[PDB]
Every structure is written in structure tokens, then in C-alpha cells.
A paper describes a structure:
We determined the structures of [name] and CBU1838 by X-ray crystallography, in the presence and absence of [name]. Although we were not able to determine a structure with a [name]-linked sugar, the side chains lining the sugar binding (and catalytic) cavity adopt conformations that are highly similar to those in previous structures. A phylogenetic tree suggests that CBU1838 groups with other 3’’,5’’ epimerases, while [name] is closer in sequence to the single site epimerases. [name] and RmlC showed a similar kcat, with [name] having a slightly lower KM.
Streptose forms the central moiety of the antibiotic streptomycin, while DHHS is found in the O-antigen of the zoonotic pathogen C. burnetii.
Residue numbers in the entry:
A (entry chain AAA), B (entry chain AAA): -2 to 200
Amino acid sequence: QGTMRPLSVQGAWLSETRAFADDRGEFQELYSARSLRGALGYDPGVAQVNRSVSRRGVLRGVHFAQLPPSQAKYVTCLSGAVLDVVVDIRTGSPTYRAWEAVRLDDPHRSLYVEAGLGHSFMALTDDAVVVYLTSQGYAAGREHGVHPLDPDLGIAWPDGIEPVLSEKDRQAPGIAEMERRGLLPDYEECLAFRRSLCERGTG
Amino acid sequence: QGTMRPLSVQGAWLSETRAFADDRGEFQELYSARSLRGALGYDPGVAQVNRSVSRRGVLRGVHFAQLPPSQAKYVTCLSGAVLDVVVDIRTGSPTYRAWEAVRLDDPHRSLYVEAGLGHSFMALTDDAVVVYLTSQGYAAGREHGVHPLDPDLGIAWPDGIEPVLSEKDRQAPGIAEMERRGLLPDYEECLAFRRSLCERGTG
Ligand SMILES: Cc1cn([C@H]2C[C@H](O)[C@@H](COP(=O)(O)OP(=O)(O)O)O2)c(=O)[nH]c1=O
Ligand SMILES: Cc1cn([C@H]2C[C@H](O)[C@@H](COP(=O)(O)OP(=O)(O)O)O2)c(=O)[nH]c1=O
Ligand SMILES: [Cl-]
Ligand SMILES: [Cl-]
């Protein structure tokens, strides 16, 4: 049926889901916990499903919950198109500060971002709708951000679209400032958290 | 924030979810497990997220998974409009064969249908998109159906829209035939299953 395959940043995955089309329309399995368990070694669970509507050029991120337990995300653009960027915010990672852009322009493609990574996207179309599943409920005191236009990340956001940032995102610190202030996830700690999820039922 | 309140059929609920609107668009908490736990006494979990696109007049249902563990559903029309009908297929229920129609015409309204109830909807607009969370993964051998146009249910589907049924739904038996063949959930068994979910962690 559908595939799930690792991206260039360890802990980020691309899901391609299958639809069964017929005269009535279509039926799609957008998310399968069984499927994630086979690929990841654990079922991340779904504490919250969030939906955002974004005007064109709106850039949300780079956001992450404090580890642990942080928040894993399964992200899908249900209509319109976004450019999703995953950011390796994890100090000590062999790919720390690296990023990868995935075009999410079809409901049949989903991005999984494990706990401890940074997530962001820009709306490529007016009223782009994004729906994401999170492993952990929202907690304002636990949510953090790095500035998406930080030259230290140097994310290639689309030429020809002016970013529209929230007040919060506009004021966000750069990666270096988050790092020195010890506010970024530690890579070793991320990997240990990953192993811990596999071990809830390794007995 | 958002409300969750019982409908007229015990085990069906209406969720009204809140969005935070701003210049960038909006952010909605479409589903909260914490919220369901407060109302229901248990977190149903999310094994699968399904998405269907339906042409106008398409009627999917009345469907249910064999109890147990059957399948609880959290259903939302993300765009366009459907008329959702919940059916009490549970023999011995004080409201057996009763139904209730909910207009799902806004992404901020969701319907929860606990394990053991029947679910169906008709597309009121062309390409109505429905997204639903299920507590249990899909299993073809476990999925059953009652004919949605059964006069023994007498569901008031919208006047002026011709139903479009799949081959499977077109051929589905009536409620009476499912009943005598012992293929419907038992009400007592439904209630016991409900109590069992509360008790996974009543220790
Ligand atoms: C992330 C999140 C935000 N919110 C609220 C807080 C704000 O009032 C509004 C937007 O928050 P914000 O953090 O700016 O969201 P985004 O990730 O889309 O940039 O939504 C929730 O209610 N729940 C959540 O899980
Ligand atoms: C309910 C369901 C159906 N399917 C498949 C079986 C069929 O080929 C197709 C449509 O099934 P069908 O049972 O007719 O779906 P609906 O509830 O929308 O009437 O989708 C899945 O792959 N997973 C599921 O969870
Ligand atoms: Cl998830
Ligand atoms: Cl559910």
C-alpha cells in the first residue's frame, strides 16, 4: 500500500499513503499506527490533532517542545501546498543545524518528525490547510522556537514570496543564542528518548 | 475552549472545537485526547486516520466493526458539508434502531461515535472531505454494514438528493436480517466494553 522512508535528517520520515479511487470519490489511509510501528519501532500515539489555515507566505516555525517528552509530529497538507522544512536543532548531532525542505502539496504525502527535531513550513498558496498529529498535548510553557530566517541555518525559503511571521516567530532567537542558553535538545538525549519509546513494551 | 456533549443516542457525542484566528489565518485544536478522557473516562487512542472524498449525494454506511474491540470514530468534515447519521444498531438498547442526524458542515464541529454504534453520512456538496480518527486499525473481515435506506430504520436522508451507494452498501442487509443472523452488537456487551476501557488504568 503506502511507503514510509527516512529523509536526510535522522528522525524525519516521508510517508506516501495510498488512496482507493472509485465512482463515489476516494478513500485514503492517511495515517496508520501499525505502519509507523513497523518503520519506527514504536507507536508514537496521538494526543492532539491540530489544524492550521495560513495565508500565502505565512511561515510558522521553527518550533519544538522541550525534550522530554517533547512532541513527535505527523504533518499533512490537506489542501493547497506548503514548503515544510525540518531542522536539526540537536546539539552534538552529526547534522546539527542542517535542514531539509519537503514540498507538501498533496494530501497523500505526510512528513513524520520525531521528538527533538525542529518543524516549520511556509504557505505556498492562500489558505493552505495543514493537519498534524502530535504525540503530546500542547503546553505553552514547553513550546520553543528558533528564528526561521536565521542566516546560521540559511534555510532556502522560496524566492519571490515575502515571509509573513507571527509576533512570536518574528522575535524568536537565532540557533546560536538558543544553543548557548542551553535551550536546544541534546542529540544523545534525543536518541535515548527514541530507545525509551521502543522499550515501553520491549518487555 | 471547546465543548464535548452527549447526543440523543448514548455513546455518541458532539465536539465543538475552538480556533484562534489572527492575521496569518487560524489555529484549531481539532481533537484532544485529554478532552475525550474528561468526557468519556478513557482515551480511545488513534490507530488510523482515514480521509474520504465524496461526490454529491454519495452515502457511505451504515458501517460498524464487530465488537470487540469494534472501532470508535471521531469524525470531522474538513470541507464542504455532510449529513452524518448515527444509528443505534445495538440489540437490547432502549433506543435500538433509533438514529440521529448531525449536519457536519464546518471543520470546528466533530462527532464521536463509540465502539458498537453504526456510522454513516451523505455528501451534501461535491467533493465533501471527511477525516476520521479510529481507535482500531481497519480489518476487512471485521467490517459490517446495514442498508442505509432500510425502511426499518427510516433515516430522513435529505429530500432532493438522490443517494449514490457503493456496490457493497447497495447490497447490504436490513437491520432485521442482521439482527436475526446475530451479526449486530449486543447492548449489554457494548456497555461492558465501555467499562473495560475505563478500567485499563482503573488500577
Ligand atoms: C501549538 C498550539 C497553539 N495554540 C494556540 C496558541 C496561540 O493562541 C495560537 C497560535 O499559536 P502559535 O504557537 O503561533 O502557532 P503556530 O505553530 O501555528 O505558529 O494557537 C493552541 O491552542 N494549541 C497548540 O497546540
Ligand atoms: C474502511 C476502510 C476501507 N478501505 C478500502 C476498502 C475499499 O477498497 C475502499 C472503500 O471501502 P468502503 O468500505 O466502501 O469505504 P466507505 O466506508 O468509504 O464506504 O477503501 C481501506 O483501505 N481502509 C479502511 O479503513
Ligand atoms: Cl504522531
Ligand atoms: Cl478515536
